[PDB]
Write a protein that binds this ligand. Structure first.
Ligand SMILES: Cc1c(N)cncc1NC(=O)Cc1cccc(Cl)c1
Ligand SMILES: Cc1c(N)cncc1NC(=O)Cc1cccc(Cl)c1
Lengths: 304, 304
Protein backbone atom coordinates (compact mmCIF):
# COMPACT_ATOMS: atom_id res chain seq x y z
CA UNK A 1 0.00 0.00 0.00
CA UNK A 2 0.84 3.70 -0.33
CA UNK A 3 0.67 5.67 -3.59
CA UNK A 4 3.45 7.78 -4.93
CA UNK A 5 4.10 9.92 -8.03
CA UNK A 6 6.33 7.19 -9.41
CA UNK A 7 8.57 7.51 -12.44
CA UNK A 8 9.76 4.65 -14.63
CA UNK A 9 13.30 3.43 -13.85
CA UNK A 10 15.54 5.72 -15.90
CA UNK A 11 18.55 3.47 -16.55
CA UNK A 12 17.64 2.56 -20.11
CA UNK A 13 17.35 6.26 -20.97
CA UNK A 14 20.49 7.32 -19.04
CA UNK A 15 22.51 5.10 -21.38
CA UNK A 16 21.29 7.17 -24.33
CA UNK A 17 22.13 10.67 -23.12
CA UNK A 18 24.89 12.64 -24.82
CA UNK A 19 26.00 16.27 -24.88
CA UNK A 20 25.68 18.12 -28.21
CA UNK A 21 27.55 21.37 -28.80
CA UNK A 22 27.30 23.50 -31.91
CA UNK A 23 29.27 26.71 -31.77
CA UNK A 24 28.67 28.18 -28.30
CA UNK A 25 25.40 26.31 -27.56
CA UNK A 26 25.41 23.06 -25.63
CA UNK A 27 22.36 20.94 -24.94
CA UNK A 28 21.40 17.28 -24.55
CA UNK A 29 21.01 14.71 -27.30
CA UNK A 30 19.49 11.21 -27.38
CA UNK A 31 21.74 8.56 -28.97
CA UNK A 32 19.78 5.59 -30.29
CA UNK A 33 21.47 3.20 -32.72
CA UNK A 34 23.72 5.42 -34.95
CA UNK A 35 21.65 8.62 -34.66
CA UNK A 36 21.70 11.44 -32.13
CA UNK A 37 18.50 13.43 -31.80
CA UNK A 38 18.52 16.93 -30.33
CA UNK A 39 16.56 20.22 -30.52
CA UNK A 40 17.45 22.09 -33.68
CA UNK A 41 18.02 25.31 -31.72
CA UNK A 42 21.46 23.92 -30.77
CA UNK A 43 22.51 25.73 -34.04
CA UNK A 44 21.39 29.16 -32.77
CA UNK A 45 23.12 31.86 -30.88
CA UNK A 46 20.99 34.04 -28.47
CA UNK A 47 20.58 36.72 -31.24
CA UNK A 48 19.28 34.02 -33.62
CA UNK A 49 16.47 32.94 -31.26
CA UNK A 50 14.42 36.18 -31.84
CA UNK A 51 13.27 34.78 -35.24
CA UNK A 52 15.58 32.02 -36.46
CA UNK A 53 15.65 30.94 -40.06
CA UNK A 54 16.63 27.37 -39.21
CA UNK A 55 17.19 26.32 -42.82
CA UNK A 56 19.70 29.15 -43.33
CA UNK A 57 21.39 28.64 -39.98
CA UNK A 58 21.82 24.89 -40.63
CA UNK A 59 23.33 25.55 -44.09
CA UNK A 60 26.27 27.29 -42.32
CA UNK A 61 26.94 24.07 -40.34
CA UNK A 62 28.92 21.01 -41.38
CA UNK A 63 29.10 17.58 -39.74
CA UNK A 64 32.34 18.56 -37.95
CA UNK A 65 30.63 21.55 -36.24
CA UNK A 66 28.39 19.20 -34.19
CA UNK A 67 30.42 18.03 -31.20
CA UNK A 68 28.82 14.99 -29.63
CA UNK A 69 30.22 13.58 -26.43
CA UNK A 70 28.89 10.52 -24.60
CA UNK A 71 30.39 11.33 -21.20
CA UNK A 72 34.02 10.68 -22.13
CA UNK A 73 33.64 9.12 -25.66
CA UNK A 74 33.60 11.60 -28.60
CA UNK A 75 31.26 10.59 -31.47
CA UNK A 76 32.15 11.11 -35.10
CA UNK A 77 29.36 12.86 -37.00
CA UNK A 78 28.92 11.58 -40.55
CA UNK A 79 25.59 13.18 -41.48
CA UNK A 80 23.10 15.78 -40.30
CA UNK A 81 19.51 16.55 -41.12
CA UNK A 82 16.70 18.58 -39.75
CA UNK A 83 13.28 16.96 -39.31
CA UNK A 84 10.70 19.47 -38.10
CA UNK A 85 12.28 20.96 -34.88
CA UNK A 86 14.85 18.22 -34.29
CA UNK A 87 18.26 17.58 -35.69
CA UNK A 88 19.31 14.06 -36.44
CA UNK A 89 23.08 13.62 -36.37
CA UNK A 90 24.20 10.38 -37.96
CA UNK A 91 27.22 9.04 -36.08
CA UNK A 92 29.66 6.32 -37.10
CA UNK A 93 29.02 4.19 -33.97
CA UNK A 94 25.75 2.61 -32.86
CA UNK A 95 25.07 3.20 -29.16
CA UNK A 96 25.92 -0.09 -27.44
CA UNK A 97 23.44 0.85 -24.70
CA UNK A 98 20.49 1.41 -27.11
CA UNK A 99 17.46 -0.14 -25.44
CA UNK A 100 14.52 -1.59 -27.46
CA UNK A 101 12.63 1.61 -28.26
CA UNK A 102 9.80 3.25 -30.15
CA UNK A 103 8.94 6.86 -30.93
CA UNK A 104 5.35 7.68 -29.97
CA UNK A 105 3.29 10.86 -30.01
CA UNK A 106 1.27 10.82 -26.80
CA UNK A 107 -2.17 12.24 -26.32
CA UNK A 108 -2.91 15.14 -23.96
CA UNK A 109 -3.76 13.74 -20.52
CA UNK A 110 -1.25 10.88 -20.80
CA UNK A 111 1.66 10.65 -18.39
CA UNK A 112 5.36 9.98 -18.80
CA UNK A 113 8.67 10.18 -16.98
CA UNK A 114 11.22 12.88 -17.68
CA UNK A 115 14.93 12.35 -17.23
CA UNK A 116 16.16 15.92 -16.66
CA UNK A 117 19.69 16.29 -18.01
CA UNK A 118 22.33 19.01 -18.24
CA UNK A 119 25.46 18.79 -20.45
CA UNK A 120 24.52 15.21 -21.35
CA UNK A 121 24.41 14.13 -17.69
CA UNK A 122 21.26 13.00 -15.91
CA UNK A 123 20.18 15.20 -12.95
CA UNK A 124 16.90 13.58 -11.87
CA UNK A 125 13.73 11.79 -12.86
CA UNK A 126 10.11 12.77 -12.33
CA UNK A 127 6.68 11.77 -13.54
CA UNK A 128 4.31 14.26 -15.13
CA UNK A 129 1.28 14.55 -17.38
CA UNK A 130 1.04 16.16 -20.81
CA UNK A 131 -1.53 18.91 -20.01
CA UNK A 132 -4.72 19.05 -22.11
CA UNK A 133 -3.21 22.32 -23.52
CA UNK A 134 -0.01 20.45 -24.59
CA UNK A 135 2.34 22.04 -22.09
CA UNK A 136 4.10 20.19 -19.32
CA UNK A 137 4.65 21.58 -15.83
CA UNK A 138 8.21 20.30 -15.59
CA UNK A 139 11.28 21.24 -13.62
CA UNK A 140 13.78 22.49 -16.17
CA UNK A 141 16.54 25.06 -16.25
CA UNK A 142 18.71 26.49 -19.06
CA UNK A 143 20.68 23.60 -20.61
CA UNK A 144 17.89 21.05 -20.01
CA UNK A 145 16.89 21.19 -23.70
CA UNK A 146 17.07 17.77 -25.27
CA UNK A 147 16.02 16.01 -22.04
CA UNK A 148 13.39 13.39 -22.93
CA UNK A 149 10.10 12.05 -21.68
CA UNK A 150 9.30 8.37 -22.00
CA UNK A 151 7.26 5.38 -20.88
CA UNK A 152 8.44 1.76 -20.55
CA UNK A 153 6.50 -1.44 -21.56
CA UNK A 154 8.66 -4.30 -20.03
CA UNK A 155 11.89 -3.91 -22.08
CA UNK A 156 10.69 -1.27 -24.56
CA UNK A 157 11.22 2.45 -24.10
CA UNK A 158 8.62 4.58 -25.87
CA UNK A 159 10.10 8.05 -26.17
CA UNK A 160 7.32 10.61 -26.37
CA UNK A 161 8.85 13.99 -25.54
CA UNK A 162 11.98 16.02 -26.12
CA UNK A 163 12.23 19.24 -24.16
CA UNK A 164 12.71 22.47 -26.08
CA UNK A 165 11.65 25.51 -24.15
CA UNK A 166 10.20 27.33 -21.25
CA UNK A 167 7.35 29.69 -21.98
CA UNK A 168 7.27 33.12 -20.26
CA UNK A 169 4.65 31.63 -17.88
CA UNK A 170 7.18 29.06 -16.56
CA UNK A 171 5.59 26.02 -18.17
CA UNK A 172 7.34 23.83 -20.69
CA UNK A 173 7.00 22.99 -24.32
CA UNK A 174 8.58 20.41 -26.50
CA UNK A 175 8.23 17.96 -29.33
CA UNK A 176 7.70 14.32 -30.14
CA UNK A 177 10.89 12.53 -31.37
CA UNK A 178 10.06 13.46 -34.98
CA UNK A 179 10.40 17.13 -33.90
CA UNK A 180 6.74 18.06 -34.08
CA UNK A 181 5.76 20.36 -31.21
CA UNK A 182 3.00 19.33 -28.89
CA UNK A 183 0.64 22.27 -29.01
CA UNK A 184 0.83 25.48 -31.02
CA UNK A 185 4.38 26.34 -30.07
CA UNK A 186 7.26 27.35 -32.24
CA UNK A 187 10.95 27.30 -31.36
CA UNK A 188 11.43 31.03 -31.17
CA UNK A 189 11.96 33.59 -28.36
CA UNK A 190 8.53 35.08 -28.68
CA UNK A 191 5.70 35.17 -26.06
CA UNK A 192 3.29 32.36 -27.08
CA UNK A 193 -0.15 31.63 -25.76
CA UNK A 194 -0.69 28.13 -24.32
CA UNK A 195 -4.38 27.29 -24.56
CA UNK A 196 -6.83 27.32 -21.63
CA UNK A 197 -5.92 24.24 -19.64
CA UNK A 198 -8.34 21.85 -17.99
CA UNK A 199 -8.12 19.17 -15.30
CA UNK A 200 -7.80 15.59 -16.63
CA UNK A 201 -11.05 14.17 -15.29
CA UNK A 202 -10.37 10.50 -16.07
CA UNK A 203 -7.07 10.75 -14.15
CA UNK A 204 -8.70 12.35 -11.09
CA UNK A 205 -11.20 9.47 -11.08
CA UNK A 206 -8.37 6.96 -11.45
CA UNK A 207 -6.61 8.58 -8.49
CA UNK A 208 -9.81 8.46 -6.38
CA UNK A 209 -9.91 4.71 -7.14
CA UNK A 210 -6.21 4.52 -6.08
CA UNK A 211 -7.22 6.28 -2.83
CA UNK A 212 -10.00 3.74 -2.14
CA UNK A 213 -7.59 0.85 -2.86
CA UNK A 214 -5.12 2.32 -0.37
CA UNK A 215 -7.73 2.99 2.36
CA UNK A 216 -8.57 6.69 1.91
CA UNK A 217 -12.33 6.41 1.54
CA UNK A 218 -13.84 9.40 3.43
CA UNK A 219 -14.98 11.05 0.15
CA UNK A 220 -17.20 8.10 -0.85
CA UNK A 221 -20.80 9.08 -0.52
CA UNK A 222 -24.35 7.66 -0.84
CA UNK A 223 -24.86 9.37 -4.25
CA UNK A 224 -24.70 8.59 -7.91
CA UNK A 225 -24.84 10.83 -11.00
CA UNK A 226 -25.17 10.53 -14.80
CA UNK A 227 -22.56 11.39 -17.46
CA UNK A 228 -24.71 14.39 -18.42
CA UNK A 229 -25.11 15.72 -14.89
CA UNK A 230 -21.45 15.11 -14.07
CA UNK A 231 -20.40 16.93 -17.24
CA UNK A 232 -22.36 20.04 -16.26
CA UNK A 233 -20.22 20.06 -13.04
CA UNK A 234 -17.04 19.29 -15.01
CA UNK A 235 -17.71 22.29 -17.28
CA UNK A 236 -18.27 24.63 -14.30
CA UNK A 237 -15.01 23.50 -12.69
CA UNK A 238 -12.86 23.45 -15.87
CA UNK A 239 -12.58 19.68 -15.99
CA UNK A 240 -12.39 17.71 -19.22
CA UNK A 241 -15.85 16.32 -20.20
CA UNK A 242 -16.07 12.62 -19.31
CA UNK A 243 -16.91 10.23 -22.16
CA UNK A 244 -17.83 6.55 -22.38
CA UNK A 245 -14.24 5.96 -23.61
CA UNK A 246 -13.02 7.28 -20.22
CA UNK A 247 -15.63 5.21 -18.35
CA UNK A 248 -14.41 2.14 -20.31
CA UNK A 249 -10.74 2.61 -19.32
CA UNK A 250 -11.84 3.02 -15.68
CA UNK A 251 -13.55 -0.41 -15.85
CA UNK A 252 -10.69 -2.36 -14.22
CA UNK A 253 -10.62 0.01 -11.24
CA UNK A 254 -14.39 -0.07 -10.96
CA UNK A 255 -14.24 -3.88 -10.98
CA UNK A 256 -11.39 -4.04 -8.41
CA UNK A 257 -13.20 -1.74 -5.96
CA UNK A 258 -16.81 -2.57 -6.71
CA UNK A 259 -17.49 1.18 -7.09
CA UNK A 260 -19.40 1.94 -10.27
CA UNK A 261 -17.78 4.68 -12.37
CA UNK A 262 -20.83 6.98 -12.05
CA UNK A 263 -20.86 6.54 -8.25
CA UNK A 264 -17.18 7.63 -8.24
CA UNK A 265 -18.24 10.57 -10.45
CA UNK A 266 -20.76 11.51 -7.73
CA UNK A 267 -17.95 11.52 -5.16
CA UNK A 268 -15.89 13.72 -7.52
CA UNK A 269 -18.92 16.01 -8.06
CA UNK A 270 -19.28 16.46 -4.27
CA UNK A 271 -15.54 17.14 -3.88
CA UNK A 272 -15.70 19.78 -6.65
CA UNK A 273 -18.76 21.45 -5.17
CA UNK A 274 -17.66 21.26 -1.49
CA UNK A 275 -13.86 21.10 -1.58
CA UNK A 276 -11.82 18.84 0.71
CA UNK A 277 -12.98 20.45 4.01
CA UNK A 278 -9.36 20.63 5.24
CA UNK A 279 -8.95 16.85 4.68
CA UNK A 280 -6.46 15.01 2.39
CA UNK A 281 -6.56 12.15 -0.14
CA UNK A 282 -3.34 10.18 -0.63
CA UNK A 283 -1.41 12.98 1.10
CA UNK A 284 -2.78 15.64 -1.26
CA UNK A 285 -5.06 18.55 -0.36
CA UNK A 286 -6.14 18.95 -4.04
CA UNK A 287 -7.58 16.68 -6.70
CA UNK A 288 -4.67 15.00 -8.43
CA UNK A 289 -4.74 14.50 -12.20
CA UNK A 290 -1.26 13.14 -13.05
CA UNK A 291 -2.11 9.44 -12.75
CA UNK A 292 -3.86 7.67 -15.62
CA UNK A 293 -6.05 4.61 -15.00
CA UNK A 294 -3.14 2.51 -16.43
CA UNK A 295 -0.72 4.12 -13.95
CA UNK A 296 -3.01 3.33 -11.02
CA UNK A 297 -3.34 -0.33 -12.08
CA UNK A 298 0.43 -0.67 -12.70
CA UNK A 299 1.33 0.90 -9.35
CA UNK A 300 -1.32 -1.02 -7.42
CA UNK A 301 -0.33 -4.40 -9.05
CA UNK A 302 3.52 -3.98 -9.03
CA UNK A 303 4.27 -4.36 -12.80
CA UNK A 304 8.07 -4.54 -13.66
CA UNK B 1 11.74 26.99 -13.42
CA UNK B 2 9.14 24.59 -12.01
CA UNK B 3 9.69 22.33 -8.98
CA UNK B 4 9.03 18.65 -8.94
CA UNK B 5 9.39 15.77 -6.46
CA UNK B 6 12.46 14.58 -8.33
CA UNK B 7 14.23 11.29 -7.75
CA UNK B 8 17.88 10.57 -8.53
CA UNK B 9 18.47 8.74 -11.84
CA UNK B 10 18.10 5.07 -10.94
CA UNK B 11 20.37 3.42 -13.52
CA UNK B 12 23.30 2.83 -11.20
CA UNK B 13 20.99 1.05 -8.74
CA UNK B 14 19.06 -0.91 -11.42
CA UNK B 15 22.35 -2.61 -12.34
CA UNK B 16 22.58 -3.95 -8.78
CA UNK B 17 19.16 -5.54 -8.40
CA UNK B 18 18.84 -9.31 -8.20
CA UNK B 19 16.13 -11.76 -7.16
CA UNK B 20 16.81 -13.88 -4.05
CA UNK B 21 14.76 -17.00 -3.35
CA UNK B 22 15.09 -19.19 -0.29
CA UNK B 23 12.62 -22.02 -0.12
CA UNK B 24 9.25 -20.56 -1.16
CA UNK B 25 10.09 -16.90 -0.41
CA UNK B 26 11.36 -14.58 -3.13
CA UNK B 27 12.42 -11.00 -2.60
CA UNK B 28 14.96 -8.50 -3.95
CA UNK B 29 18.67 -8.39 -3.24
CA UNK B 30 21.35 -5.75 -3.87
CA UNK B 31 24.49 -7.09 -5.58
CA UNK B 32 27.54 -4.92 -4.93
CA UNK B 33 30.99 -6.34 -5.65
CA UNK B 34 30.80 -10.07 -4.68
CA UNK B 35 28.08 -9.73 -2.03
CA UNK B 36 24.30 -9.79 -2.28
CA UNK B 37 22.42 -8.03 0.50
CA UNK B 38 18.79 -8.86 1.24
CA UNK B 39 16.31 -8.86 4.16
CA UNK B 40 16.92 -11.84 6.40
CA UNK B 41 13.21 -12.74 6.36
CA UNK B 42 13.81 -14.34 2.93
CA UNK B 43 14.54 -17.47 5.11
CA UNK B 44 11.05 -17.49 6.67
CA UNK B 45 7.84 -19.09 5.68
CA UNK B 46 4.55 -17.26 6.60
CA UNK B 47 4.23 -19.40 9.81
CA UNK B 48 7.77 -18.36 10.82
CA UNK B 49 6.98 -14.62 10.67
CA UNK B 50 4.78 -14.71 13.85
CA UNK B 51 7.97 -14.83 15.99
CA UNK B 52 10.97 -15.99 13.97
CA UNK B 53 14.10 -17.28 15.61
CA UNK B 54 16.34 -16.09 12.78
CA UNK B 55 19.47 -17.77 14.13
CA UNK B 56 17.72 -21.16 14.17
CA UNK B 57 16.05 -20.66 10.82
CA UNK B 58 19.36 -19.69 9.17
CA UNK B 59 21.12 -22.76 10.63
CA UNK B 60 18.78 -24.94 8.50
CA UNK B 61 20.02 -23.13 5.34
CA UNK B 62 23.12 -23.83 3.27
CA UNK B 63 24.71 -21.72 0.54
CA UNK B 64 22.95 -23.79 -2.15
CA UNK B 65 19.50 -22.95 -0.69
CA UNK B 66 19.91 -19.25 -1.62
CA UNK B 67 18.98 -18.90 -5.29
CA UNK B 68 20.25 -15.62 -6.66
CA UNK B 69 19.36 -14.58 -10.17
CA UNK B 70 20.49 -11.37 -11.88
CA UNK B 71 17.76 -11.28 -14.52
CA UNK B 72 19.00 -14.22 -16.58
CA UNK B 73 22.43 -14.93 -14.92
CA UNK B 74 22.41 -17.35 -11.94
CA UNK B 75 24.91 -16.47 -9.17
CA UNK B 76 26.86 -19.09 -7.28
CA UNK B 77 26.61 -18.59 -3.52
CA UNK B 78 29.84 -19.38 -1.68
CA UNK B 79 29.07 -17.94 1.77
CA UNK B 80 26.22 -16.58 3.86
CA UNK B 81 26.00 -14.54 7.02
CA UNK B 82 23.45 -12.61 8.92
CA UNK B 83 24.28 -9.07 10.07
CA UNK B 84 21.47 -7.59 12.16
CA UNK B 85 18.34 -7.94 9.89
CA UNK B 86 20.17 -8.46 6.60
CA UNK B 87 21.69 -11.46 4.99
CA UNK B 88 24.93 -11.11 3.11
CA UNK B 89 25.37 -13.79 0.46
CA UNK B 90 28.93 -14.00 -0.82
CA UNK B 91 28.88 -14.86 -4.52
CA UNK B 92 31.72 -16.05 -6.73
CA UNK B 93 31.34 -13.17 -9.23
CA UNK B 94 31.72 -9.44 -8.57
CA UNK B 95 28.87 -7.44 -10.12
CA UNK B 96 30.34 -5.86 -13.26
CA UNK B 97 27.78 -3.06 -12.90
CA UNK B 98 28.76 -2.17 -9.29
CA UNK B 99 28.77 1.62 -9.11
CA UNK B 100 31.05 3.56 -6.69
CA UNK B 101 29.02 3.25 -3.49
CA UNK B 102 28.85 3.83 0.24
CA UNK B 103 26.54 2.58 2.97
CA UNK B 104 25.15 5.43 5.06
CA UNK B 105 22.65 5.63 7.90
CA UNK B 106 20.55 8.71 7.21
CA UNK B 107 19.01 10.97 9.77
CA UNK B 108 15.24 11.40 10.18
CA UNK B 109 14.10 14.28 7.97
CA UNK B 110 16.57 13.45 5.19
CA UNK B 111 15.33 12.45 1.75
CA UNK B 112 16.26 9.69 -0.67
CA UNK B 113 15.08 7.92 -3.80
CA UNK B 114 13.55 4.47 -3.72
CA UNK B 115 13.82 2.06 -6.61
CA UNK B 116 10.76 -0.17 -6.06
CA UNK B 117 11.48 -3.68 -7.31
CA UNK B 118 9.63 -6.99 -7.57
CA UNK B 119 11.34 -10.34 -8.33
CA UNK B 120 14.63 -8.50 -8.86
CA UNK B 121 13.12 -6.23 -11.54
CA UNK B 122 12.73 -2.47 -11.14
CA UNK B 123 9.11 -1.19 -11.22
CA UNK B 124 9.54 2.54 -10.55
CA UNK B 125 11.42 5.28 -8.78
CA UNK B 126 10.17 7.89 -6.33
CA UNK B 127 11.58 10.39 -3.87
CA UNK B 128 10.58 10.39 -0.22
CA UNK B 129 11.67 11.54 3.22
CA UNK B 130 12.61 9.41 6.22
CA UNK B 131 9.88 10.58 8.67
CA UNK B 132 10.98 11.98 12.05
CA UNK B 133 9.43 8.75 13.48
CA UNK B 134 11.68 6.59 11.22
CA UNK B 135 8.95 5.27 8.94
CA UNK B 136 8.68 6.02 5.27
CA UNK B 137 5.41 6.64 3.44
CA UNK B 138 6.39 4.57 0.42
CA UNK B 139 4.53 2.73 -2.29
CA UNK B 140 5.30 -0.94 -1.74
CA UNK B 141 3.48 -4.20 -2.24
CA UNK B 142 4.26 -7.81 -1.24
CA UNK B 143 7.55 -8.82 -2.91
CA UNK B 144 9.01 -5.28 -2.70
CA UNK B 145 11.23 -6.32 0.25
CA UNK B 146 14.87 -5.72 -0.52
CA UNK B 147 14.11 -2.63 -2.65
CA UNK B 148 16.59 0.10 -1.67
CA UNK B 149 16.69 3.80 -0.96
CA UNK B 150 19.70 5.86 -1.99
CA UNK B 151 21.20 9.23 -2.79
CA UNK B 152 23.82 10.04 -5.44
CA UNK B 153 26.85 12.44 -5.10
CA UNK B 154 28.16 12.73 -8.76
CA UNK B 155 29.30 9.12 -9.39
CA UNK B 156 28.81 7.72 -5.86
CA UNK B 157 25.66 5.94 -4.73
CA UNK B 158 25.05 6.19 -0.98
CA UNK B 159 22.64 3.41 -0.11
CA UNK B 160 20.67 4.35 2.99
CA UNK B 161 17.61 2.11 3.11
CA UNK B 162 16.55 -1.45 2.42
CA UNK B 163 12.83 -2.11 2.58
CA UNK B 164 11.58 -4.77 4.97
CA UNK B 165 7.98 -4.35 5.90
CA UNK B 166 4.66 -2.66 5.92
CA UNK B 167 3.20 -1.82 9.29
CA UNK B 168 -0.54 -2.43 9.91
CA UNK B 169 -1.01 1.35 9.43
CA UNK B 170 0.23 1.13 5.80
CA UNK B 171 3.53 2.91 6.36
CA UNK B 172 6.89 1.32 5.75
CA UNK B 173 9.83 0.23 7.78
CA UNK B 174 13.27 -0.91 6.89
CA UNK B 175 16.95 -0.92 7.68
CA UNK B 176 20.24 0.68 6.80
CA UNK B 177 22.53 -1.58 4.67
CA UNK B 178 24.08 -3.05 7.83
CA UNK B 179 20.59 -4.38 8.69
CA UNK B 180 19.83 -2.05 11.57
CA UNK B 181 16.20 -0.94 11.53
CA UNK B 182 15.40 2.72 11.39
CA UNK B 183 13.12 3.22 14.36
CA UNK B 184 11.94 0.74 16.98
CA UNK B 185 10.82 -1.91 14.54
CA UNK B 186 11.53 -5.58 14.50
CA UNK B 187 11.16 -7.99 11.59
CA UNK B 188 8.19 -9.88 12.92
CA UNK B 189 4.45 -10.06 12.08
CA UNK B 190 3.37 -8.21 15.17
CA UNK B 191 1.52 -4.84 15.42
CA UNK B 192 4.23 -2.26 16.25
CA UNK B 193 3.82 1.33 17.29
CA UNK B 194 5.57 3.93 15.11
CA UNK B 195 6.22 7.01 17.21
CA UNK B 196 4.23 10.27 17.00
CA UNK B 197 5.37 11.84 13.75
CA UNK B 198 6.06 15.51 13.16
CA UNK B 199 6.41 17.76 10.12
CA UNK B 200 10.02 18.43 9.04
CA UNK B 201 10.14 22.18 9.62
CA UNK B 202 13.48 22.87 7.94
CA UNK B 203 12.20 21.12 4.78
CA UNK B 204 8.95 23.13 4.71
CA UNK B 205 11.06 26.30 4.94
CA UNK B 206 13.34 25.03 2.18
CA UNK B 207 10.28 24.37 0.01
CA UNK B 208 8.90 27.88 0.71
CA UNK B 209 12.27 29.22 -0.53
CA UNK B 210 11.89 26.95 -3.63
CA UNK B 211 8.42 28.50 -4.13
CA UNK B 212 9.82 32.05 -3.97
CA UNK B 213 12.60 31.11 -6.43
CA UNK B 214 9.98 29.75 -8.83
CA UNK B 215 7.62 32.76 -8.51
CA UNK B 216 5.03 31.60 -5.97
CA UNK B 217 5.32 34.44 -3.47
CA UNK B 218 1.76 35.20 -2.26
CA UNK B 219 2.53 33.82 1.24
CA UNK B 220 5.35 36.33 1.89
CA UNK B 221 4.24 38.83 4.44
CA UNK B 222 5.40 42.02 6.23
CA UNK B 223 6.24 40.08 9.44
CA UNK B 224 9.17 38.56 11.20
CA UNK B 225 9.41 36.24 14.22
CA UNK B 226 12.05 34.84 16.61
CA UNK B 227 13.19 31.21 16.98
CA UNK B 228 11.41 31.12 20.35
CA UNK B 229 8.12 32.51 19.08
CA UNK B 230 8.22 30.35 15.96
CA UNK B 231 8.88 27.26 18.07
CA UNK B 232 5.78 27.89 20.20
CA UNK B 233 3.80 27.75 16.88
CA UNK B 234 5.77 24.71 15.69
CA UNK B 235 4.88 22.86 18.91
CA UNK B 236 1.16 23.69 18.56
CA UNK B 237 1.14 22.43 14.96
CA UNK B 238 3.29 19.30 15.51
CA UNK B 239 6.28 20.65 13.62
CA UNK B 240 9.86 19.82 14.55
CA UNK B 241 11.42 22.63 16.69
CA UNK B 242 13.69 24.81 14.54
CA UNK B 243 17.31 25.14 15.69
CA UNK B 244 20.25 27.33 14.67
CA UNK B 245 21.63 24.24 12.85
CA UNK B 246 18.50 24.34 10.64
CA UNK B 247 18.80 28.11 10.18
CA UNK B 248 22.46 27.58 9.16
CA UNK B 249 21.61 25.02 6.44
CA UNK B 250 18.93 27.40 5.11
CA UNK B 251 21.61 30.11 4.69
CA UNK B 252 22.19 29.53 0.95
CA UNK B 253 18.47 29.85 0.21
CA UNK B 254 18.20 32.93 2.40
CA UNK B 255 21.15 34.44 0.52
CA UNK B 256 19.75 33.53 -2.94
CA UNK B 257 16.34 35.08 -2.19
CA UNK B 258 17.31 37.87 0.17
CA UNK B 259 14.64 36.59 2.61
CA UNK B 260 16.01 36.23 6.13
CA UNK B 261 15.30 32.82 7.66
CA UNK B 262 13.21 34.32 10.49
CA UNK B 263 11.13 36.33 7.99
CA UNK B 264 10.42 33.03 6.15
CA UNK B 265 9.53 31.54 9.56
CA UNK B 266 6.98 34.36 9.96
CA UNK B 267 5.44 33.40 6.60
CA UNK B 268 5.33 29.76 7.76
CA UNK B 269 3.79 30.84 11.10
CA UNK B 270 1.02 32.72 9.24
CA UNK B 271 0.40 29.73 6.93
CA UNK B 272 0.13 27.41 9.97
CA UNK B 273 -2.23 29.74 11.81
CA UNK B 274 -4.38 30.71 8.77
CA UNK B 275 -4.05 27.81 6.33
CA UNK B 276 -3.69 28.30 2.57
CA UNK B 277 -7.08 30.05 2.06
CA UNK B 278 -7.85 27.76 -0.91
CA UNK B 279 -4.57 28.82 -2.62
CA UNK B 280 -1.59 26.62 -3.68
CA UNK B 281 2.21 26.73 -3.42
CA UNK B 282 4.17 24.87 -6.11
CA UNK B 283 0.99 22.99 -7.07
CA UNK B 284 0.40 21.80 -3.50
CA UNK B 285 -2.51 22.72 -1.22
CA UNK B 286 -0.52 21.64 1.90
CA UNK B 287 2.87 22.47 3.36
CA UNK B 288 5.38 20.14 1.77
CA UNK B 289 8.17 18.64 3.88
CA UNK B 290 9.90 16.14 1.53
CA UNK B 291 12.51 18.53 0.15
CA UNK B 292 15.64 19.28 2.18
CA UNK B 293 17.51 22.58 1.75
CA UNK B 294 20.15 20.57 -0.21
CA UNK B 295 17.44 19.19 -2.51
CA UNK B 296 16.08 22.67 -3.21
CA UNK B 297 19.56 24.00 -4.08
CA UNK B 298 20.36 20.96 -6.26
CA UNK B 299 17.07 21.16 -8.14
CA UNK B 300 17.20 24.94 -8.54
CA UNK B 301 20.88 24.87 -9.77
CA UNK B 302 20.69 21.73 -12.04
CA UNK B 303 23.42 19.54 -10.39
CA UNK B 304 24.27 16.30 -12.37
C1 LIG C 1 15.77 28.75 -20.13
C2 LIG C 1 15.08 27.40 -20.15
C3 LIG C 1 14.48 26.89 -19.02
N1 LIG C 1 14.51 27.54 -17.79
C4 LIG C 1 13.80 25.66 -19.11
N2 LIG C 1 13.71 24.94 -20.24
C5 LIG C 1 14.30 25.44 -21.33
C6 LIG C 1 14.99 26.64 -21.32
N3 LIG C 1 15.56 27.11 -22.54
C7 LIG C 1 14.87 27.83 -23.44
O1 LIG C 1 13.68 28.11 -23.31
C8 LIG C 1 15.71 28.37 -24.58
C9 LIG C 1 14.85 28.63 -25.80
C10 LIG C 1 14.40 29.91 -26.10
C11 LIG C 1 13.52 30.12 -27.16
C12 LIG C 1 13.10 29.06 -27.94
C13 LIG C 1 13.59 27.80 -27.66
CL1 LIG C 1 13.09 26.45 -28.64
C14 LIG C 1 14.46 27.58 -26.62
C1 LIG D 1 3.09 -7.02 2.35
C2 LIG D 1 4.10 -5.92 2.17
C3 LIG D 1 3.75 -4.71 1.62
N1 LIG D 1 2.47 -4.43 1.16
C4 LIG D 1 4.73 -3.70 1.52
N2 LIG D 1 6.00 -3.85 1.93
C5 LIG D 1 6.34 -5.03 2.46
C6 LIG D 1 5.43 -6.08 2.59
N3 LIG D 1 5.87 -7.29 3.18
C7 LIG D 1 5.86 -7.50 4.51
O1 LIG D 1 5.52 -6.65 5.33
C8 LIG D 1 6.22 -8.92 4.93
C9 LIG D 1 6.75 -8.95 6.34
C10 LIG D 1 5.94 -9.29 7.42
C11 LIG D 1 6.42 -9.20 8.72
C12 LIG D 1 7.71 -8.78 8.96
C13 LIG D 1 8.53 -8.49 7.88
CL1 LIG D 1 10.17 -7.99 8.17
C14 LIG D 1 8.07 -8.57 6.59
Amino acid sequence: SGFRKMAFPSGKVEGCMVQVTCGTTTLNGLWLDDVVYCPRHVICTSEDMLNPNYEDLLIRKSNHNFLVQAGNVQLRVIGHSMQNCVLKLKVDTANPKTPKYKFVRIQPGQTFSVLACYNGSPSGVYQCAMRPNFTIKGSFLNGSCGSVGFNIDYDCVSFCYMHHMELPTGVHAGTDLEGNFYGPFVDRQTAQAAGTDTTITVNVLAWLYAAVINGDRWFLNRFTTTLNDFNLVAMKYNYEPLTQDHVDILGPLSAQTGIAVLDMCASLKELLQNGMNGRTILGSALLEDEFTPFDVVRQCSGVT
